C-alpha cells in the first residue's frame, strides 16, 4: 500500500519465504494464522521492528506442505498451531541442570515431561523427524523449550494438562528408530499348551503388567481363554533398553539393578511424578529438586533397564 515491510514466512524455521506486507492490514488478513516465536500475531498489524523477521504460518500450498512433512513427519492440519501455542509457554519455563542432566522446574503440571526428558538422556535412542533431532540436541545442551513444545504437540497435550509417562514415551518411541529391536515371548497353559509370539519395534521394548525385568524372565501370570491362568515368559530380547510398566504400586528399587524409574503419587485425575536414577547412589530428581538415599521405596509406575542381547535358559 502506501506502506510495506519485508518479512519472511516459514514452517520449519530453516527454509524462508520472502513476503512484502501492508502495514495497514493484519497478518491474518494477509497470511492466515501467523506466529512470531510462538506468539499469535494473526490479529496484529505489522510493526517497524518486524522488518526482516521470520514468522511461522500454516501449510497452505504444495511447497509448504512438503517442507512441513519433511521436517515434522505429520500432516495433522492443527499441528503447527498446537506447537506454536505450547512454545509460547515452554519458552518461559526454566531448565536447570540437575546431577548433570537437563530437567524442568515445575510449572503447569509438567512433572510427567520432566521425568520423560530425564529418562531420554539415560537411554540410547535416536529420533527420525528432523524437528525432534534438532530440538533434542538443543535440550541436551540445556535449551529444551522447543523440544518440550514438540512433545506436547506430538502427544496432543496442551500446557497444563496432566499426562501419563508411559503414553508419552510410546509416542516418542513411535518417532524413533527402533527397527532393530526384537522380542520373543512364550505363553504356557496347562490346558491349551504353549504359544510363541514375536514383537518388533516399539512393542519389543515396552511391557505393561510388571515392573521387574527378572520376573518377566521367570514368568508372569496372565489370563488364558480357557479360564485358567497361563504363564508368559521372555524367550529372547534384542534392544539397547527395555521399559517395564504397571499401575502404581509400592515397589522397592535396589541400587545397581535398574537404570531409572518413574514414581506417581495421586489418582486418575491429579497427581505428581518424580524421577529416580541409579548412579553412584540413588538420586530422586523432582523437577529442580534433588535428594539422595541408599534405598528407595514408593509408588513406581515405570522402570527402565539396560539391555543388549538376552536368551532364556528355560526349556
Binding site for Zn ion (CB under 5 A): 189, 191-192, 224, 226, 228
Pick 188 or 235: Cβ nearer Zn ion: 188
The order of strands in the sheet holding 34-36 is 17-22, 4-10, 54-57, 34-36, 39-40
**No. of helices (H) and no. of strands (E), the chain:** 9, 19
The order of strands in the sheet holding 289-293 is 206-208, 241-253, 296-306, 260-266, 271-278, 282-286, 289-293
Q: What's the closest the beta carbon of residue 201 comes to Zn ion, in angstroms?
A: 28
For the chain, the 3-state helix, strand and coil shares in percent, each to the nearest 5, are 25, 35, 40
Pick 75 or 229: Cβ nearer Zn ion: 229
Q: Which three cell numbers stand for residue 109?
A: 503440571
State in Å, rounded, how far the first CA of the chain is from the last one. Answer: 81
User: Is 224 marked within a binding site?
Assistant: yes
Q: What's the closest the beta carbon of residue 185 comes to Zn ion, in angstroms?
A: 16
Pick 195 or 311: Cβ nearer Zn ion: 195
Pick 192 or 222: Cβ nearer Zn ion: 192
Pick 156 or 191: Cβ nearer Zn ion: 191
Q: What's the CA angle centered on 143, arms 304 and 161, to 5 degrees? A: 65
Distances (CA, A) of 118 to 70, 122, 148, 152, 259: 27, 7, 12, 16, 11
Pick 219 or 271: Cβ nearer Zn ion: 219
User: Is 192 marked within a binding site?
Assistant: yes
Q: What's the closest the beta carbon of residue 189 comes to Zn ion, in angstroms?
A: 3
Q: What's the closest the beta carbon of residue 184 comes to Zn ion, in angstroms?
A: 20
Q: What's the closest the beta carbon of residue 188 comes to Zn ion, in angstroms?
A: 9
Pick 28 or 209: Cβ nearer Zn ion: 209
| CA 257/CA 278 separation, integer angstroms | 8
Q: What's the closest the beta carbon of residue 222 comes to Zn ion, in angstroms?
A: 11
Q: What's the closest the beta carbon of residue 239 comes to Zn ion, in angstroms?
A: 29
Contact 11, 57 (CB under 8 A): yes
| CA 226/CA 296 separation, integer angstroms | 40
Closest CA to 56 of 40, 75, 78, 70: 40
Q: From its phi and psi, is residue 108 left (phi > 0), alpha (psi between -120 and 50) or beta?
A: left
Q: Which residues of 3-14 are buried (b: 16+ CB within 10 A; e: fewer)?
A: eebebebbbbee
Binding residues for Zn(2+): 189, 192, 224, 226
Amino acid at each position: 500500500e502506501v506502506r510495506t515491510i519485508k518479512v519472511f514466512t516459514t514452517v520449519d524455521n530453516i527454509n524462508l519465504h520472502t513476503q512484502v506486507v501492508d502495514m495497514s492490514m493484519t497478518y491474518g488478513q494477509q497470511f492466515g494464522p501467523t506466529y512470531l516465536d510462538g506468539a499469535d500475531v494473526t490479529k496484529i498489524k505489522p510493526h517497524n521492528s518486524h522488518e526482516g523477521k521470520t514468522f511461522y504460518v500454516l501449510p497452505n500450498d504444495d511447497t509448504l506442505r512438503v517442507e512441513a512433512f519433511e521436517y515434522y513427519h505429520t500432516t495433522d492440519p492443527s499441528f503447527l498451531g498446537r506447537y506454536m501455542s505450547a512454545l509460547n509457554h515452554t519458552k518461559k519455563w526454566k531448565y536447570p541442570q540437575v546431577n548433570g542432566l537437563t530437567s524442568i522446574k515445575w510449572a503447569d503440571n509438567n512433572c510427567y515431561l520432566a521425568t520423560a526428558l530425564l529418562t531420554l538422556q539415560q537411554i540410547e535412542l535416536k529420533f527420525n523427524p528432523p524437528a525432534l533431532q534438532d530440538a533434542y540436541y538443543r535440550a541436551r545442551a540445556g535449551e529444551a523449550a522447543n523440544f518440550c513444545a514438540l512433545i506436547l504437540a506430538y502427544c496432543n497435550k496442551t500446557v497444563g494438562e496432566l499426562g501419563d509417562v508411559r503414553e508419552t514415551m510410546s509416542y516418542l518411541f513411535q518417532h524413533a528408530n527402533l527397527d532393530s529391536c526384537k522380542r520373543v515371548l512364550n505363553v504356557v497353559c496347562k490346558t491349551c499348551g504353549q504359544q510363541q509370539t514375536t514383537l518388533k519395534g516399539v512393542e519389543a521394548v515396552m511391557y505393561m503388567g510388571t515392573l521387574s525385568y527378572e520376573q518377566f524372565k521367570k514368568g508372569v501370570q496372565i489370563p488364558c481363554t480357557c479360564g485358567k491362568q497361563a504363564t508368559k515368559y521372555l524367550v529372547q530380547q534384542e534392544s539397547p533398553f527395555v521399559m517395564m510398566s504397571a499401575p502404581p504400586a509400592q515397589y522397592e528399587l535396589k541400587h545397581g539393578t535398574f537404570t531409572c524409574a518413574s514414581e506417581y503419587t495421586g489418582n486418575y485425575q491429579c497427581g505428581h511424578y518424580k524421577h529416580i536414577t541409579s548412579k553412584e547412589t540413588l538420586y530422586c530428581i523432582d523437577g529442580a529438586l534433588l535428594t539422595k538415599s541408599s534405598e528407595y521405596k514408593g509408588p513406581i509406575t515405570d522402570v527402565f533397564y539396560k539391555e543388549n542381547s538376552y536368551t532364556t535358559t528355560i526349556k
